[PDB]
Specification:
heterodimer, A: mainly alpha, two-stranded parallel ribbon, 8 helices, globular, B: alpha+beta, protein ne1242 fold, four-stranded antiparallel β-sheet, two-stranded antiparallel sheet, 1 helix, 6 strands, binds copper (II) ion, metal binding protein, tyrosinase
Chain lengths: 276, 78
Amino acid sequence: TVRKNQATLTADEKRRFVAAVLELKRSGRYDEFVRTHNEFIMSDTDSGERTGHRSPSFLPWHRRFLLDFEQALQSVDSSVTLPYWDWSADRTVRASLWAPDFLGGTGRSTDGRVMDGPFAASTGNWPINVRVDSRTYLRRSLGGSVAELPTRAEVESVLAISAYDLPPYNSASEGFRNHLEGWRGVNLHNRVHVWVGGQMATGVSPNDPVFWLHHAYVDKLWAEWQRRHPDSAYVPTGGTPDVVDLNETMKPWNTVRPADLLDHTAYYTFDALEHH
Amino acid sequence: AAPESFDEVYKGRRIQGRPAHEHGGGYEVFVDGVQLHVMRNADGSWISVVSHYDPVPTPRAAARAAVDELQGAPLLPF
Ligand SMILES: [Cu+2]
Ligand SMILES: [Cu+2]
Ligand SMILES: [Cu+2]
């Protein structure tokens, strides 16, 4: 299984990916991924139990969530893998990602409605069901709520951080995980969610298929981080209330630990991953 | 300590906040009577479920960011 930069997919890889995603939506399976993510968004808290976000397990949790989603895609079309969006390189509204043959573009100014692409409400193929904002069409405002996506130099400044995570292991932390997640510093992953806007800015952000491509690149950056820091590893490593320690199991699956997910090569590789 | 309560009409919508599947809220917000999940960050900023990746300073700011996001639409309860 090779996860490819979206910018490099062939026309029929894009076609096969879109059709598999639309089939997961048609069959009812897609929306439960949205629902699971919103439940963790609403429950993960800086002062209490936290698993999916604002905690060290943010990265293995989304790695396992994406694996579950990729496996569902492969149950529909076994050739499909999750592509990633390098938002540091493909940083404008004119990137091929946002073309009508892939994800469609930005939303119109009146209501943020996406008007083209296979996920446009007008297609009849992408109902927004799991939602908080009651409107039922995909919305985006690319670059509307924040000026720019992160740059390569900003990502490198985060990759150079040696400590995986640090007490108090939450949104206030110093350390790589929280700088990648974005609650502190120049802000990588949160800022991308805000830049897309629409459902991507909300707890039901997997309503937008770009969610997967964003998190596949966040996931790649953890891999890059490991190769930059082969001497550094997941923390904490035991006895931390409310935080998932290295060998502790993770909700909602319960049958997998951060430890099981540190090496992605047991599950997939990337098209390219710099050796250390 | 909890933030103070508030009640105002903002962009045509009634927003209310008060100290009090999702986390044990210490604070509740409502938009036209429908409750909106909001959360406090360790640094004292706030977010809501419809602006979850964008910290703002206060629960009223979060409520206002939700009305901004909704562009007139009713909220669905969580
Ligand atoms: Cu910093
Ligand atoms: Cu995210
Ligand atoms: Cu070395």
